[PDB]
Amino acid sequence: VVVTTIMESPYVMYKKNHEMFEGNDKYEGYCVDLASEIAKHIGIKYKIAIVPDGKYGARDADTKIWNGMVGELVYGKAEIAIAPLTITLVREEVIDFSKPFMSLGISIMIKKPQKSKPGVFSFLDPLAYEIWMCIVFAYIGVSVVLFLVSRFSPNEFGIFNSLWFSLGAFMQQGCDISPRSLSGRIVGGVWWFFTLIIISSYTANLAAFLTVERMVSPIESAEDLAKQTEIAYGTLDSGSTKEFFRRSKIAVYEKMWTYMRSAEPSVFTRTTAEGVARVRKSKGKFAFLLESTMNEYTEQRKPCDTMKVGGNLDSKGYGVATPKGSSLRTPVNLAVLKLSEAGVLDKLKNKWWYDKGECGPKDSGSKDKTSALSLSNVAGVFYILVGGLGLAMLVALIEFCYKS
Amino acid sequence: RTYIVTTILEDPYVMLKKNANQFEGNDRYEGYCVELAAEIAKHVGYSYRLEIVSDGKYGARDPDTKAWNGMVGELVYGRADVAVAPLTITLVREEVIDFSKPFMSLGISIMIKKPQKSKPGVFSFLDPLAYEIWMCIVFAYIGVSVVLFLVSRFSEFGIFNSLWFSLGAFMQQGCDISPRSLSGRIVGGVWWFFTLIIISSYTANLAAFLTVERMVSPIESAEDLAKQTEIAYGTLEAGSTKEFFRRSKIAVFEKMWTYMKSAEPSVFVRTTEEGMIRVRKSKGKYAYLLESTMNEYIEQRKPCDTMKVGGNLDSKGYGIATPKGSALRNPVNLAVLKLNEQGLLDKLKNKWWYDKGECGSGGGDSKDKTSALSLSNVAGVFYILIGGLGLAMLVALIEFCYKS
Amino acid sequence: VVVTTIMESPYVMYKKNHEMFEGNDKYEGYCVDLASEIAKHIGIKYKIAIVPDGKYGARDADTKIWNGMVGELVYGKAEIAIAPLTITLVREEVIDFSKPFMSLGISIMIKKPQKSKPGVFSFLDPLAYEIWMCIVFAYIGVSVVLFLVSREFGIFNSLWFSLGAFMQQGCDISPRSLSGRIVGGVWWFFTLIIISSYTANLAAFLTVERMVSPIESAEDLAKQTEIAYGTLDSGSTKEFFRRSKIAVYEKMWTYMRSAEPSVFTRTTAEGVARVRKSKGKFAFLLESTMNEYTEQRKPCDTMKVGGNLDSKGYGVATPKGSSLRTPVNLAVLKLSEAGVLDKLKNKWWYDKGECGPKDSGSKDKTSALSLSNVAGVFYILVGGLGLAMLVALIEFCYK
Amino acid sequence: RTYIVTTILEDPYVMLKKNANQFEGNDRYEGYCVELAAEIAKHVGYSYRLEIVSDGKYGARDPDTKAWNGMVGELVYGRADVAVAPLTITLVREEVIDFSKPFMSLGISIMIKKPQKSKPGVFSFLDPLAYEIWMCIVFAYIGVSVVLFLVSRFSEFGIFNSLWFSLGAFMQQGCDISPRSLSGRIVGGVWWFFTLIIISSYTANLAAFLTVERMVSPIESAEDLAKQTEIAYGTLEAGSTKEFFRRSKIAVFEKMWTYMKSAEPSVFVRTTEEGMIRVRKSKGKYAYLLESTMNEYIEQRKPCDTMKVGGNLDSKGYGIATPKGSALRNPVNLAVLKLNEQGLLDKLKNKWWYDKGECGSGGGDSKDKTSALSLSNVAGVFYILIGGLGLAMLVALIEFCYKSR
Amino acid sequence: RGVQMLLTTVGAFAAFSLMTIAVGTDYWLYSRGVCEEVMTHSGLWRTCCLEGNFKGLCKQIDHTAEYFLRAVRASSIFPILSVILLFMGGLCIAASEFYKTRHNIILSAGIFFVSAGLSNIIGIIVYISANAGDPSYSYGWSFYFGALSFIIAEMVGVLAVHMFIDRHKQL
Amino acid sequence: DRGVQMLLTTVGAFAAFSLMTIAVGTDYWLYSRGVCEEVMTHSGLWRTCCLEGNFKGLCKQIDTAEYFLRAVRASSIFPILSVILLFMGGLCIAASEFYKTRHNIILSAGIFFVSAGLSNIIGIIVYISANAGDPSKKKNSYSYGWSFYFGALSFIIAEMVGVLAVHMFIDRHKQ
Ligand SMILES: O=c1[nH]c2cc(C(F)(F)F)c(N3CCOCC3)cc2n(CP(=O)(O)O)c1=O
Ligand SMILES: O=c1[nH]c2cc(C(F)(F)F)c(N3CCOCC3)cc2n(CP(=O)(O)O)c1=O
Ligand SMILES: O=c1[nH]c2cc(C(F)(F)F)c(N3CCOCC3)cc2n(CP(=O)(O)O)c1=O
């Protein structure tokens, strides 16, 4: 009995380095343990031989030869193979496949953000956006009504005095002299009430903003990813994902393909290692597209900077390949089905995928990072400071030129 | 000859047109399954006549005291060859017949109601306090206003001056006129102390409410639902969900299974539509697990108040029944895998599950969570601003009428 | 083999389906399942019987007989006793005991810890008392300094200036001395910084609403507190407290002997009913298993165990001259070592419970602020207003 | 006849006297075990003379060449009738000889360092705003002060009035120096806006810092340890604790057993002493998971930085070893049960574990748990304020110069 | 200035009528309570449920700083003294409108009346504090008459201090 | 007593000139711990170099509401405009100390001193925004160097001259 397994896949791991625990079980992983489990289930001799082709499987129909595990099975040197192998049109007609033990997904991934350091938008982040315009409109209106009360109703206050009175009214400090009337007291009181409610709401809002943090994702779906058109995207230079994107039928996928058509900075990455290095180097743009299993494998790797958004662009699965029909095809099919129905396959999957990872142990977020008000949250505050003081000096100079 | 295709009466796949009457004959059914049957008959080449199973049940091949019936029962009896219908892959229906290929992936998942909270207007302004406290502070303000006026008349100033000084004292303002005598000075001091303590308390309460409102844990995946222990969950008494829960192996799913077996929320469901009704009527206090296919069908066809959350708990597939010793086993497998890989099946799924759905979730964009205020609670600030402008126009018009 | 057991609520209970089956498969819990496990371990047919007397097992010390399980095994009625039975000095010369498979002792229990609602203390619930003593001391000091360094600022004008500075307001009049400006600025800065700190502390207190453990958390704190304490009428706890030489329990014994005689209760149900009606009253000292049973029942209000005191063992009883004594000893040792009594204990006393809120904390809505946190302000407000109008009347009538 | 008892010293049983070996021998033994041996010899009547352990260990099953060692190995291989030194209950110990009764119980318990922290003084004032922001706002305050003087004297109202208005503006207090021109008014307004947003941001950050500092809770029980992150913990290797962890099958116990099974850090250590010393060296995140008895012993040691937290995970017990068929098996069982009931064992535990401890004699040393800003953190402001007031007093004397010199 | 004294007289008489309606009858307790949720009512010396399981009966109810506030909130002795002090305030206002040449004692009567008003304020707020202290109550359209009693007290006070302002011109 | 005041203004301006020259000459701004690894690197506004490491001896030049500030940080346009306006202020106060008849000269001097304060604030705020604006920056940080303190002292003597010369403006205006 000969079984093949590609070592260049996230399904095997070396035991120590070499000449330690020597023998037959030199590789430990998902696929080899599944093979051992089914061999204990039905009775199958254990083998260690690996095809020197390297590729999982390909159809070189131009030369009428099959390369990889599927070619090694169809020409004949083995009968049982456990490896990550996709199922396609040309592979089924030559080699029958069993039921898929694991579902495959294709998804986009982005780099985990670090922080946001904008300019005036730092101070603009709380208390929304339109509230500023509405409160400036309210300030102008209350200044107009105060000027009308002071002038039309029965004084020594012009438009500048009225706007200064309204500005000091907005800032819970007081005034130099009261209008001393029964009319202005109520409007001054309601304006003071509104501005103190606004200031208390701002303080509470910033306290709630700073006590906890959420890190909302910039994107949530592939449709929104295509619609935003601000982050670079690259699938792969060639392979199953590129072929699926080049020959898709869903309406948004043709738009996505035309977006790849007008790609300037060489989004076609030669190797997946270069792609993950590029997406882990720069977080501002260049989000990647990759298979779900490889993304989940990179989710538990020492850099610990990656996050998927969910959603499966394409659905397929990994199956067990056997050469033609024999007395072992039905046996291995029922063995795979029985192991898939039972949780033992899921037990092995969860164990080997979560016990080998350390990045996901710190789930959600870490609350032990507070420090103080660094300049990131203060850059807006001091930028509005420098703008206000510069504009105040400028208007002081022009008002001196106007009057004195 | 003329071949037959048997189809189970299932809601999300095949529809018997409610009009009945005309269009009877070949086009008696419109839906996913009949379209797939027409496509496979046009591809491999035969004529199909629709049939309905007698007992109306899926059936199984359990080793009971005979009395075998169902879809596989009528397949093995002789009067059935091709069954284009949904069919879960199970070991009890594999020992006699084999399936071709899972065209789509099945997965059990939790379903949740839509969390919708509409913040009121002027009611939301008094939300970060008790209305008794607002009544207390306003009535204490007017009481200390008249008391301050009488003690100033006892130990220059009028009713308007008294109101101005009292409200400016109420809300941390300076004044041009001085509170003469030590008695008036200490009244002003103690009432300033009260307004400072009450403004600090109000700001603290608003900060606490916003902190507890933002710091919330939405339910995702299964671990969060397992360790929240606040929302009821359950499945059917019998079916694939009960079989999967009985054979759990993972520690977290073992905890979920023993929590379900504790019978604190029980199952409380007979038909899954009744579970959908009771989870709509639970106002988010209950949750229910069911298949992703029917969950998507509920989220589309029913009014948009329920959807899915989290990933699939397990990997499962579909299939079409084929005879053990017929010539219609391999070509149908090759053609259905061709349709699955090409994406025409994906196109039909998109057409039947995204186009003819009276829901704006997939037909329009969602709402972006920008945090801070969103014209919901500050909307109440704008309605008390509307009250403020009402008081301002009231006092201005009544003053002009009094002078008139 | 035949075994007798005593109907004890946290060890054996009647099943809901009483009419489904009668016999061996009629009970569920710690005792009967442990008996089934050890019987399957050695290999024997076993039957379950109830005690005819109901006694826990003690010597009457006058007729030289035993009533209960020890009385039945001594007089030849049962050759094994899987029912729980504590190890005492009197129950060794007539009966044999195995190694203790459970550890129990006398533990404290209090009522439900809830948030208090004081009237005056809620005005300054955060911060402390010395903080406001020092702020008043600093207020008087800065008033005196400002009055002395400015020489219109008399013995009332400077006081008014400092008081206005204490609540974020300026003043109508300002001095012409830079010393006064400096002292007013630093006092304004201190007032603003302490008001900000107080407001933030109140916000944190209101947003956590965390309940702190009461004073009754240790025996030393139990002896130093004014709260009441109680125990059972006559039993293992009473026998332990009758004779002591540890120099920490004699004070507790004198506290029992000097307080009201209401501290003694007949049954544990009456005791939990008596402690349930008041947040304070008398905290009790009772068995650890009784506390663990009561903390996982439908009234999920009191679930406080506190510190662990005393040592006691629960063991299986076997008669003298039995060939299975070594067999049952090695059996209970194997179950204690490999671990299935602890697994069943976790599955039954912890996993099987009316509420699971003790496993993980939950967040509750803080609701409205109510008025208890504000009621203390109105009292000093009306008191200061009354003092002010009385002094105004006196000053205007006299001067 | 004189009876020899096998005694092995770890802590604090057979510790030798501080006067070296100037005494007569066996009479120079002080501890819990030797006092219990003297009492149990006086109860029924025999000799309590100690014996020297041959191997210095406790003994193991030793599947190679069978045999036995330790105290139980000396007991089974003749020349021993009474064993006083404590030893754990194990199946291989029971399959050869039998115990009497566990005189006092124990269990494996979690061990953490005592949380010790001190609030700062003037440095506590710069917690929620760091120190660069304070310098920036102070220098901006003097800049806007000289700018306000420029616009007041360019567009009374001297430098003194400008400082008055700026100092009133920095705390939103106001002043009576109101210029006729709108320029100084708008300068004051924008400076009011700046100082108010600084005050609001400071309040927000101090509230957030206090909430996040006080919200965290100390570790307790075992479930919180199971869901704990970023803190290391484990047990030793040469001991029965690892065997008990491996033999457990409870879902939570097997859960964290699988958690530290992939021991990426140095979870397993060799000896208790070296592990304790390296915990002292680290003192930020580690737990040793030792027995409750030795943990209670080491929390009474000289450094006084260790404490007992949580409960016992199991119900292990001690026992005094006796040979099978001897005449000193049942009377010693009756007498040890009598002393266990009498509470004399509790008295000996109190005197040799809480009274003779030179450090930490009073366990209730810090239990107020003041969850508010006491006079340790905010009173540092009271320092700098009085320092500022002292500065005020200092400038007062130089202003006294401006008054009189 | 006859309008001023007739306004004081009509305000005092209206305050008499509405405060008698407020304190005399048994109408002020609405809450989600159990007397089985049925209509309940508190009172000055007794508590009564109009319908339900307590029909035809009207039961005489029972019950340093904490003890004092509990006694004031439960026994309601201080509200009794406050409404009786309102009665003497109304009687001395009647004496004031009978003795129109009373320069200082009319002002003293005003001070006594506003003192009774603030005493009623402190009483009703400690009452609702004790109502909120039960777990660890709304306007009953007669507790609304108590609120209107506060409003009419403030109104008669402000028109009174308006006519002492008129007295400043008169004197 | 105006000769001592004008001498104080002159010596303050000379101190400001000396501080500006040693700022544009030396590179003691920040005692940063970077690479040449956390090692003492003279991070400069105009010249950044090192003292330790394997690459010691060779160093080079450094480099809708963020692009302008980034270009300001890269080009150092505001410190350059600041030192030019200090040069202009020195020239104008030299004209004031040589020519007493003119009056607008000290108006220009006061405007130049105040704009020096403005430009110094802008420069220091863009410098601390460049230093503290990155979340990546690194076990140790902060601990500003000596030239930050020299710039602070230049700012303090800037209010000193901007108070005393403006007081001289007030007294010459009232006389
Ligand atoms: O049968 C096939 N099975 C495959 C399985 C895997 C995976 F399981 F993820 F390892 C991958 N990885 C994709 C990501 O980078 C590493 C290799 C490639 C596969 N390919 C080549 P494709 O045609 O480029 O997809 C096949 O042909
Ligand atoms: O040794 C003894 N151990 C005991 C242990 C328990 C239990 F808690 F169940 F474990 C009890 N239960 C207390 C609650 O009511 C049912 C009996 C009684 C015990 N008694 C009888 P006492 O003489 O009344 O103390 C003993 O003597
Ligand atoms: O019988 C036994 N009795 C033991 C008694 C003790 C203790 F009392 F605590 F001194 C200890 N200590 C454990 C902590 O470090 C110091 C030694 C070990 C014992 N062991 C070996 P284990 O396999 O480590 O339990 C036994 O075999």
Residue numbers in the entry:
A (entry chain B): 397 to 550, 571 to 820
B (entry chain C): 389 to 543, 566 to 814
C (entry chain D): 397 to 547, 572 to 819
D (entry chain A): 389 to 543, 566 to 815
E (entry chain H): 6 to 40, 55 to 82, 93 to 165, 174 to 208
F (entry chain F): 5 to 40, 55 to 81, 93 to 166, 170 to 207
How is this structure described in the published paper?
AMPA-type ionotropic glutamate receptors (AMPARs) are integral to fast excitatory synaptic transmission and have vital roles in synaptic plasticity, motor coordination, learning and memory. AMPARs are tetrameric assemblies composed of subunits GluA1 to GluA4 and exhibit a modular architecture comprising three layers: the extracellular N-terminal domain (ATD), the extracellular ligand-binding domain (LBD) and the transmembrane domain (TMD). Here, to determine the subunit composition, physiological architecture and gating mechanisms of CP-AMPARs, we visualize these receptors, immunoaffinity purified from rat cerebella, and resolve their structures using cryo-electron microscopy (cryo-EM). Our results indicate that the predominant assembly consists of GluA1 and GluA4 subunits, with the GluA4 subunit occupying the B and D positions, and auxiliary subunits, including transmembrane AMPAR regulatory proteins (TARPs) located at the B′ and D′ positions, and cornichon homologues (CNIHs) or TARPs located at the A′ and C′ positions.
To elucidate the architecture and subunit arrangement of CP-AMPARs, we characterized the structure of cerebellar GluA1-containing CP-AMPARs in the presence of MPQX, a competitive antagonist that stabilizes receptors in a resting, non-desensitized state. To explore the composition and arrangement of auxiliary proteins, we focus on the LBD–TMD layer of particles from all classes, except for those in class 2, because in this class, we observe additional density on the ‘top’ of the receptor, suggesting that this class represents a distinct group of receptors. Of note, the olfactomedin domains of NOE1 or NOE3 align exceptionally well with this density, enabling us to conclude that class 2 represents a noelin–AMPAR complex. Consequently, the receptors in class 2 are A1A4A1A4 receptors, in which A4 occupies the B and D positions and A1 is located at the A and C positions. The focused classification and refinement of the LBD–TMD layer yielded similar results to the non-NOE1–A1A4A1A4 complex, resulting in a 4.2 Å resolution map that revealed four auxiliary subunits at the A′ to D′ positions. Notably, NOE1 stabilizes the amino-terminal domain layer without affecting gating properties of the receptor.
